[PDB]
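Exercise 7. Predict the joint structure of the components listed below.
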Amino acid sequence: IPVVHDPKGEAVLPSVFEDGTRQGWDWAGESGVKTALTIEEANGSNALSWEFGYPEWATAPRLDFWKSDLVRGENDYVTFDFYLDPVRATEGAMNINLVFQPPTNGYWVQAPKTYTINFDELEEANQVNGLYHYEVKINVRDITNIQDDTLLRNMMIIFADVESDFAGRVFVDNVRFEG
Amino acid sequence: VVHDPKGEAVLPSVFEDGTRQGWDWAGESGVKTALTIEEANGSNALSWEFGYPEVKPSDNWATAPRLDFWKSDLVRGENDYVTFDFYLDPVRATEGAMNINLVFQPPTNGYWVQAPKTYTINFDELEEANQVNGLYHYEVKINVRDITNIQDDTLLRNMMIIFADVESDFAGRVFVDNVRFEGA
Ligand SMILES: [Ca+2]
Ligand SMILES: [Ca+2]
Ligand SMILES: [Ca+2]
Ligand SMILES: [Ca+2]
Ligand SMILES: [Ca+2]
Ligand SMILES: [Ca+2]
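Solution:
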């Protein structure tokens, strides 16, 4: 049978994953990873979670969130808590990028700046018994091609390899816009 | 500050005529130090020196060198990548990384399109990089085929290259050579 995710639920922000569902989160059709998305505990709260490892954006997990009334408004950032529990992580890095697909902008605008996690610097990261925590914060005020009322349609988060050996489980929680 | 002669915009940019072949600092560049032509790896290259500050602005591009290249009839064509040779000769590089991004400003797409994939250099991995006598050589290759908001004939107007700090202590001289579009 196909991979089966936990129930999808209804798209809501902030996404907190406390109702047993993915609160509208799913794989993008073009995701390089389509493994099971389940709700798992991280740092005392339920979180969206999956496992994967990079060979060898083709190998990159790409999460997707569709919501009809998604607009930037007066928000300046998208933020989320991100946790990693590696089985292997000793070299390279991971780049996290944010994309929206406004129909008025050819179905693609990207937050200009990349959020980078450097696996050679894990012993400097916030951590509890092999669970590493990053407060991912990506500036969306800096997107000039949209206005505050532009219908964004869907948000994608891309987790791309940078010559890493990462393999393990990851967790996403508290996805929200912030001023 | 005195740069070497700007020259005329030529692509591919090989820097063999004693000029910058049209390359300059973007107005928003965080570094505006002398841009000169210097030898790297047996060829002449566009070069500057700088170091990132220890205090990191929350705007992750405020301290980034930003090169800019204006040319008429700047188009992707059937090419899939922008490539260049990038060299670093650090005096300090013990931690962090550098993110290289590529931006064009087509008037038909809001004066801003960006290659989706960042090219990242990890300073913790210098011992694994190609080097000769302290000069590290990276083959920067950035996919532009994946920009869906341009077409092969879209006038791009200008190209900038942003060299952003990722929690690094880099200080030293860098070199850029052989900037071009190329096919997959
Ligand atoms: Ca939660
Ligand atoms: Ca582990
Ligand atoms: Ca040259
Ligand atoms: Ca110091
Ligand atoms: Ca080369
Ligand atoms: Ca040196």
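Discussion. The two ends of chain B are 39 Å apart (CA to CA).
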